Paper text:
However, this belief has recently been challenged by the discovery of a dsRBD serving as a major tRNA binding module for human dihydrouridine synthase 2 (hDus2), a flavoenzyme that catalyzes synthesis of dihydrouridine within the complex elbow structure of tRNA. Dus2 is found in all eukaryotes and catalyzes formation of dihydrouridine 20 in tRNA. By solving the crystal structure of this dsRBD in complex with a dsRNA together with extensive characterizations of its interaction with tRNA using mutagenesis, NMR and SAXS, we establish that while hDus2 dsRBD retains a conventional dsRNA recognition capability, the presence of an N-terminal extension appended to the canonical domain provides additional residues for binding tRNA in a structure-specific mode of action.
A closer look at the sequence alignment revealed that the adjacent residue, R361, bears a positive charge and is also conserved. To assess whether the reduced binding capacity of this double mutant is a direct effect of the missing positive charges and not a consequence of structural change, we solved its X-ray structure. No obvious changes are observed as evidenced by a RMSD of 0.18 Å over 82 Cα between the mutant and wild type structures. Although, R361 and 362, both localized in NTE helix 310, are not contacting the dsRNA, they are nonetheless relatively close suggesting that they recognize a structural element present in the tRNA and absent in dsRNA or they undergo a conformational change activated by the tRNA substrate itself.
Numbering used by the authors: 347 to 442
The structure:
């Protein structure tokens, strides 16, 4: 119904919570592929004066983003993928 604006959650990617190879970005890409959706599109947001990074991910016309800032583009993108999965109640590829 409504796919406008941005959906947010307070999330930060913790690599220790995930198996050696799988990441939230990979889980989200696979979910899109299984659902026959366009692959996720990531756009970086920066606060250069603080060396901070955020990412807004678009999946099925909806924007998702963490409320929190990260130390790199890569880390911000994993956070954005977590928001996308978690807000939808989807499995995130965690250990437990
Ligand atoms: C994917 As970008 C060009 O917003 O870092
Ligand atoms: Cl999970």
């Amino acid at each position: 119904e409504d796919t406008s604006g941005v959906i947010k959650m307070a999330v930060k990617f913790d690599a220790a919570a995930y198996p050696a190879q799988i990441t939230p970005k990979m889980c989200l890409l696979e979910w899109c592929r299984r659902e026959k959706l366009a692959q996720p599109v990531y756009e970086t947001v920066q606060r250069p004066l603080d060396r901070l990074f955020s990412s807004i991910v678009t999946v099925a016309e909806q924007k998702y983003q963490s409320t929190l800032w990260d130390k790199s583009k890569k880390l911000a993108e994993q956070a954005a993928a977590i928001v996308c999965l978690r807000s939808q109640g989807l499995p995130e590829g965690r250990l437990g």
